[PDB]
Amino acid sequence: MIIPVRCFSCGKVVGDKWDAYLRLLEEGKQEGDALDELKLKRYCCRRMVLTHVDLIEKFLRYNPLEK
């Protein structure tokens, strides 16, 4: 739904690296190189950013219920 704050397995904070990851991918870097540049060594952390699906961008497209 939205990038988790902590890696499930170990507990490293990965919630502050989603925007940087998208910026790096925008510049043409490969996914492995982008994850390496963010200093994500353990594959337990790498799966958190690699396999995250961002669904909040789909929930936000609905008109807000209040105003």
Partner: protein, 263 residues
Amino acid sequence: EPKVNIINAQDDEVELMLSDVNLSLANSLRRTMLAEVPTLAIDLVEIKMNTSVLADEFISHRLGLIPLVSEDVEEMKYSRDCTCEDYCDECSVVLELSARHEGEEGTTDVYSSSLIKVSGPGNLNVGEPVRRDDYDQGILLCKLRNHQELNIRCIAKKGIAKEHAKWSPCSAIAFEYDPHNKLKHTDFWFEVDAKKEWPDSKYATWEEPPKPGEVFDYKAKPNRFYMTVETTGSLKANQVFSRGIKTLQEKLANVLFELENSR
């Protein structure tokens, strides 16, 4: 008799080698650093308004996981051990968040930098959310579109990672000993040859490989331990190590006092 040798040092991780200690002492130190060093984390969320697409308890869970600076948490008291009615400034830190999107187009991101410390213990360096730099926006908390507002008041308390994983100062403690398997503590699965099918340890160059004609030594014990301590930023690596040692000492001293008072 015990010795410490530091390999790499940083604000967030230290890589060190312990020697002349028992394996049990090193493992107890690792366990204490993982789950018994007190830190500060958000423990109550009072939601005054939440019109975002995320559930209230979703955002509460996300907030609880945000690391807060816990340098002076020793001076702070536990919530259950404070005689004050309700919460005072000496057992809790109050943070407040207020986010809103203006205009009828675009999306606003709510970051942990928006958490503003309102009240806390006097002159104690605790409560502020951890920031990598002065320009680091921090952990992404939520997203908002037009006419969606988030207005909450959070209270941070002192606790340990035994109660909940959000109070853990460390992320992952790499721990390793005997790279060349001279003690034969593990038996290596193989298909053809066990020597060339197994990758070398990252500390294999720190110890002399066994000689081809060497016999097994049954009198040897694990003596040198290589461990890396990574933190979430709430506490520095040296602070985590020192406070783990101090916590272990306090536990043993409590046991000793109980024994001496038992008679």
